[PDB]
Write a protein that binds this ligand. Structure first.
Ligand SMILES: CCCCC[C@H](CC(=O)NO)C(=O)N[C@H](C(=O)N1CCC[C@H]1CO)C(C)C
Ligand SMILES: CCCCC[C@H](CC(=O)NO)C(=O)N[C@H](C(=O)N1CCC[C@H]1CO)C(C)C
Ligand SMILES: [Fe+2]
Ligand SMILES: [Fe+2]
Ligand SMILES: [Mg+2]
Lengths: 161, 159
């Protein structure tokens, strides 16, 4: 379990490099380390830059249910311009929550750690999670996406139950 | 010591009302409570909405900044010059962000006895005054940040 970087660390602001070689022991190790870190923190997702690794690798999936997924070198294409506001938190921004507008429906493409292609359509929370994780790959944390800072604050204050 | 409200509380997001009557026991008690709370938290300033009181009262003092009670304030920039600087807030513990503020301002207001206050301030003095008065119009400093690359946890930004 690697330490999760916190907002303020310049490494969270970088644009991640694509993975060049699949099905390698080092990539398998990266994925294993990420799942260990994510599960330990009870996260719904994790991006490699969050543990200081500048590669386009994200994982996500939790039992609404989101499929357990390793997504590498991703691209996201919105199906429509419809957007929806939802509450987000981030392991790199502990103690806070913010309302973030995301696309309601997306197609996304990428590869697993064996280099097998992934092509999916997602909506709602699933789509939100993928957008949130992929944002980390271009050096974005959700406060960069917040438009209404009345809807940003400490979890304990926003949700006292 | 009154609790300092934390970001997310709707009371931090409102327009404060002016004080109508000066030199009252309730105003003296407010000022005392604010100073006790501020000092307990090691702050350089405090605004009444931060303890849930929606009135145009701020205090500050820490080129030392003079200890001041400023009521019903107005701020007028002397020039349009601005400078970016790191800010934190007792209502936003653990974080810092870069905020642009006017470099030079005049400000006007009253003390708790109703005596006028009229000053010119620059640099940090001007920054604290702008920061405190922003609370009176429902503004927390993350609302003034345009570039969140310059925002993060204090311990990480400044180890
Ligand atoms: C929701 C969009 C973000 C999902 C991914 C994050 C994990 C993370 O840091 N991603 O890089 C997460 O688990 N966030 C959780 C989160 O935001 N949740 C959990 C489900 C509901 C929502 C809070 O409203 C908690 C742990 C902060
Ligand atoms: C700086 C502009 C804001 C000044 C007032 C705040 C206090 C506050 O919340 N006022 O409403 C303060 O003391 N902030 C301090 C602060 O921001 N400082 C201390 C001096 C330098 C700067 C940190 O960069 C600490 C306590 C967070
Ligand atoms: Fe995150
Ligand atoms: Fe403040
Ligand atoms: Mg009146």
């Amino acid at each position: 379990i690697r330490e999760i970087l916190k907002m303020g660390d310049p490494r969270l602001l970088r644009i991640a490099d694509p993975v060049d070689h699949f099905d390698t022991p080092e990539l398998h190790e990266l994925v294993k380390d990420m799942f260990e870190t994510m599960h330990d923190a009870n996260g719904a997702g994790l991006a490699a830059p969050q543990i200081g690794v500048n590669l386009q690798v994200v994982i996500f999936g939790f039992g609404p249910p989101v499929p357990e997924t390793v997504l590498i070198n991703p691209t996201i294409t919105p199906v429509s311009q419809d957007m929806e506001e939802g509450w987000e938190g981030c392991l790199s921004v502990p103690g806070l929550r913010g309302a973030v507008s995301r696309f309601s429906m997306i197609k996304y493409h990428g590869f697993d750690q064996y280099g097998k292609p992934i092509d999916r359509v997602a909506e709602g929370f699933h789509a939100r999670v993928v957008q949130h994780e992929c944002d980390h790959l271009i050096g974005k944390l959700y406060p960069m996406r917040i438009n209404d800072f009345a809807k940003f604050g400490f979890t304990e204050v926003l949700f006292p139950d």
